[PDB]
Structure 1
Amino acid sequence: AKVHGSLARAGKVKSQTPKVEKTEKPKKPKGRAYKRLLYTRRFVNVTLVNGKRRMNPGPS
C-alpha cells in the first residue's frame, strides 16, 4: 500500500474540539463509605423498576 500520505492533519480533531472546563462538584466519599452509597442506591431505597432496572438513564 501507500506509505507517504500527508501528516499535516495530525491531531486535527483534538486541537479543534472546544474546551469546556470540568465542573466543580460534591466530593464523593472514598473507601467503605462509597461501597455504602452504592448499596443504599442499588438495593436499600431503590429508584425505579420500569419493567426491569436501569443504572445510567437520562431522558426516559
Structure 2
Amino acid sequence: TSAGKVRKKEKKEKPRPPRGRAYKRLLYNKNFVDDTHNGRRLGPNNLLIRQK
C-alpha cells in the first residue's frame, strides 16, 4: 500500500573511452577489422563469456 516499496551495488571504475572522432575509429575497428563461428551477434552470452 506504500508507494515506493520497490523504490545496492557500487559503480565499477574503468578508464574512460576516447571521445570525439576516436570513438568512430574503434567502432570501425570493432566490426570491420577486429574479430567480433555461428555467424555473429552483438554481445550475446557466448561472446561475453569468452572475454570474461
Listed as ranges, the gaps of 5+ residues in structure 1 are 1-7
Aligned residues: 46
Question: What pairs up with 1:39-58 in 2 under 5 angstroms?
Answer: 39-47=28-36, 50-58=37-45
Q: After the TM superposition, which parts of structure 1 deviate over 6 Å for at least 4 consecutive aligned residues?
A: none
Listed as ranges, the gaps of 5+ residues in structure 2 are 47-52
1:3-60 CA-partner distances (Å, limit 9, x unpaired): xxxxx4211112xxxx11111011111111001111101111223xx332111122x2
Larger Rg: 1
- When normalised by structure 2's length, the TM-score is 0.69
Q: Distance in 2 between matches of 1:27 and 1:51?
A: 32
Which protein has the bigger helix share? 2
- Aligned with 1:42: secondary structure? helix
